[PDB]
């Protein structure tokens with residue numbers, strides 16, 4: 131009825147047949163070549179794996195189970211007196227493949243408040259983390275340690291059946307998602323609020339609202355932001371470092387805690403989730419070289435000076451997207467409504483006028499348009515969330531929705547250990563010299 | 565001369581030229597196909613990535629820089645009054661590509677002893693861990709926390725040129741390797757020695773010698789076993805889950821601590837690094853459900869009764885090996901010297917005669933021969949290392965040599981973000997049509 135696990139149980143066999151048939155027809159269809167450059171170039175262009183929950187077209191950006199970002203904004207339930215879609219609804223869409231009702235989302239909000247409790251060892255561990263240990267490290271470390279509560283771990287130990295794996299994944303996933311805000315808040319409050327307490331969960335709030343509550347914020351429009359932020363960062367194909375990592379570690383039948391932890395270590399990398407900060411540093415240091423109110427003239431110079439001395443315009447470019455990211459567009463549209471005269475935004479805005487002419491002028495690139503991380507920083511900063519180094523953690527909490535949604539399906543569809551073949555250069559040389 | 569960092573510095577340019585020359589020759593060449601099966605099958609058979617430290621030809625097993633395990637045992641240096649190759653030596657060979665001298669290995673031992681200090685927050689954190697948190701979660705959790713000491717993560721933030729990456733990676737790598745016995749020992753002693761101290765490092769002993777001193781073992785033979793165990797488990801190509809996670813996570817410019825912690829979460833997965841435990845569970849019952857002394861017909865039947873029951877014979881088969889794993893043989897040889905009349909050994913030896921004959925008959929198994937995990941448990945148990953849960957910590961400490969050797973070279977050769985393209989089922993169906 132409103133029980134996602136019952137709804138999913140009834141979906142899994144249907145999907146299994148469709149897939150089993152599909153491989154019994156076209157298993158041996160070559161879909162791509164592999165060049166030496168692909169092997170040295172990080173599988174660039176390589177169709178490597180199956181990821182069901184979302185798909186990224188290099189022209190119009192991401193689709194969540196078929197639906198674009200605007201479509202999700204319209205259809206997905208909202209909070210009473212809201213206009214941004216709830217992450218709960220997004221998760222439902224990724225798990226079921228179908229847009230949820232108000233009442234399904236409501237029940238999901240209720241389920242995640244119940245399971246939001248932390249074991250004590252985890253609370254102590256966070257309390258005893260120094261202030262020079264990066265937020266993301268604390269996140270990953272804490273999630274790893276949560277694995278002692280894992281149903282899948284003990285289940286597997288007793289010799290549970292393969293047919294039942296997805297069920298324990300599910301429970302572990304619902305528990306992890308529920309507890310993430312709490313972990314993320316504790317970290318945030320220990321690092322930036324003199325260790326004060328996160329308080330209690332409220333069973334009649336949504337996931338996002340409890341999160342902002344535990345953080346210490348009490349702004350409506352912030353909570354709307356969080357809602358949107360968490361939705362649009364949730365998933366981005368299987369090929370991204372953090373999704374690939376969760377998939378890779380998941381395929382060894384590691385439980386959701388270990389898989390997600392690993393994915394966070396992936397997300398923590400500069401070329402992945404840490405781009406959110408990079409942008410805001412480069413934005414502020416820009417507003418240091420110039421004033422805080424640069425026009426277009428000086429602006430055109432600073433861009434070119436960054437692009438002659440041998441540097442990158444941050445939050446611009448992508449590994450497959452070749453147009454403006456719909457995630458950027460979406461964050462921009464939010465700003466046009468709520469904070470249109472913000473100095474930092476209008477700087478962001480001004481770069482969107484100038485940078486996508488000078489990057490496709492100079493060449494030495496492929497995607498001259500912005501990505502999601504070019505925009506998130508200024509939104510957070512507007513609302514008092516000024517601690518750059520915490521920003522990726524917000525990313526982390528969002529991306530759990532997507533990667534856990536996928537992991538449930540991987541273990542229901544019995545995806546096996548990811549285990550490609552590697553080559554040395556030496557060995558590569560002899561191979562081509564057949 | 566004896567400074568590994570400087571010798572590495574000399575080799576990097578040459579290796580850069582070689583790969584560039586080779587890419588400037590066969591850059592566009594096709595090395596293999598990508599099928600629908602490989603997509604749902606976890607990149608099986610797919611030539612996924614370049615990995616330099618080791619290569620696993622399915623015929624003759626692992627080679628470290630073109631050297632086999634037997635060659636290494638013969639060529640790599642040993643401890644004064646010893647027979648088993650020092651992992652220091654292995655690490656030297658993977659990083660440089662050359663066999664180290666007596667002197668060169670000696671130096672490496674001192675450098676790792678020099679760097680063995682554990683930050684106090686990690687010591688605290690480890691001591692506050694509960695016993696229902698698995699050894700591997702504690703290892704991974706601790707390694708993440710250690711990234712407060714990452715010179716690379718600081719340097720990167722401060723804006724360092726790419727060409728210097730490798731040098732910071734090298735430093736962090738040496739610290740991580742230097743500190744892993746200290747962590748692994750602290751975990752062992754908290755879990756199995758009522759939380760007693762590990763004891764001091766001795767800067768004149770070897771890595772494996774200090775390790776077992778902190779583990780609190782002082783049978784020469786077990787120190788020798790450790791030495792062998794840490795060498796042979798060191799690396800196994802790029803395509804295994806632990807090496808590949810680190811590769812993948814490393815490619816986002818996450819530091820060696822985050823990369824290795826992620827790899828350990830992959831390694832903690834049942835299908836990757838529990839087979840040693842699984843073997844010894846299945847060997848134990850075999851010596852209760854059947855007599856200790858068993859005929860080779862009774863045993864042979866047991867195997868067939870095993871296969872029919874829908875259960876696998878642990879220790880046998882592999883994802884790409886198609887013959888007796890050299891790491892098995894290596895350990896078999898060690899046992900014939902040091903414990904030939906051990907009952908648990910005589911069984912392992914018995915199964916080596918039988919199990920291969922029956923799996924090929926059945927037909928299913930493409931690799932009817934044993935893997936490393938078949939043999940390690942009985943050697944460990946014999947010396948009083950009977951804590952099965954901990955076994956994977958040993959594996960992990962070993963694998964640090966391989967994955968961090970490679971990580972230095974991935975950053976020195978400027979390998980880019982690993983980022984394949986994924987597809988949904990529904991998306992795949994549309995693709996094969998057009």
Ligand SMILES: CC(=O)SCCNC(=O)CCNC(=O)[C@H](O)C(C)(C)COP(=O)(O)OP(=O)(O)OC[C@H]1O[C@@H](n2cnc3c(N)ncnc32)[C@H](O)[C@@H]1OP(=O)(O)O
Pocket residue numbers: 400401402405437441442443444445446447448449489494495496497498501502503980
């Ligand atoms: C993943 C995310 O959402 S953000 C990742 C981090 N972002 C940043 O650092 C800001 C700019 N973005 C980047 O450079 C990104 O790492 C990427 C994904 C665009 C890199 O793209 P690649 O996969 O290398 O392919 P692409 O053909 O676009 O890049 C090749 C060249 O273009 C350059 N380039 C790419 N985007 C830009 C840009 N916006 N400005 C200047 N140069 C650029 C690269 O630096 C590279 O030059 P190099 O070979 O001398 O190093």
Ligand SMILES: CC(C)(COP(=O)(O)OP(=O)(O)OC[C@H]1O[C@@H](n2cnc3c(N)ncnc32)[C@H](O)[C@@H]1OP(=O)(O)O)[C@@H](O)C(=O)NCCC(=O)NCCS
Pocket residue numbers: 835836839871875876877878879880881882883923927928929930931935937938
């Ligand atoms: C490692 C392992 C998972 C690799 O198998 P794989 O990559 O799936 O591929 P295979 O070619 O071996 O599989 C072919 C068939 O042989 C079976 N098989 C493989 N090894 C077997 C063994 N030791 N005993 C019985 N059956 C075996 C598989 O179950 C499979 O049956 P199916 O195709 O009808 O489902 C498998 O050999 C195994 O389970 N071994 C025992 C566990 C172990 O020691 N693992 C450590 C190394 S990772």
Ligand SMILES: O=C([O-])CC(=O)C(=O)O
Pocket residue numbers: 366369370371401402449501983
């Ligand atoms: O990095 C990638 O491959 C895609 C990405 O931006 C993301 O995951 O948010």
